[PDB]
């Protein structure tokens, strides 16, 4: 239903949806559970660029978090991490090239200086 609500309702609603998925994620034990929960939060965020676009500090945190999961060994997660990353890079492309508020350098730069550390563990297709 992304885009069927007013941006302002969208915000309040998404803050509630993911604050508690995050909370659930920490709650449930077993990587099997955490992997499912984690993938879902990622799917959700991926579907709400407009949200991401208006909140850089959250966007950046999601992307850095996506980079972390690219080293996750649990089956499927790496595919999730990359798939979400491409949605986000398309839909939020400008926010990576222009200096955002509270930062001194375009985020793309930090990415380019670490390509290797980030893709380390990824399979060819994911790369």
């Amino acid at each position: 239903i992304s885009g069927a609500m007013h941006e302002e309702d969208e915000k309040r609603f998404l803050v509630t949806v993911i604050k508690d998925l995050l909370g659930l994620c920490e709650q449930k034990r077993g990587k099997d559970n955490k992997a499912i929960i984690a993938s879902n939060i990622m799917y959700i965020v991926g579907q709400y660029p407009r949200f991401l676009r208006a909140h850089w500090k959250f966007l950046k945190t999601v992307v850095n978090k996506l980079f972390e999961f690219m080293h996750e060994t649990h089956d499927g997660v790496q595919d999730m991490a990359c798939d979400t990353f491409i949605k986000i890079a398309q839909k939020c492309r400008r926010h990576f090239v222009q200096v955002q508020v509270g930062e001194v350098m375009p985020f793309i730069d930090e990415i380019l200086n670490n390509i290797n550390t980030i893709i380390c563990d990824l399979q060819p297709q994911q790369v």
Partner: peptide, 27 residues
Amino acid sequence: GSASGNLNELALKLAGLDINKTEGEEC
């Protein structure tokens, strides 16, 4: 609207998401 900031505090929360990393606990 001015909109100073708030989403900044919502970021520190996501910092708590375990799944693998190490986990050296067992029965």
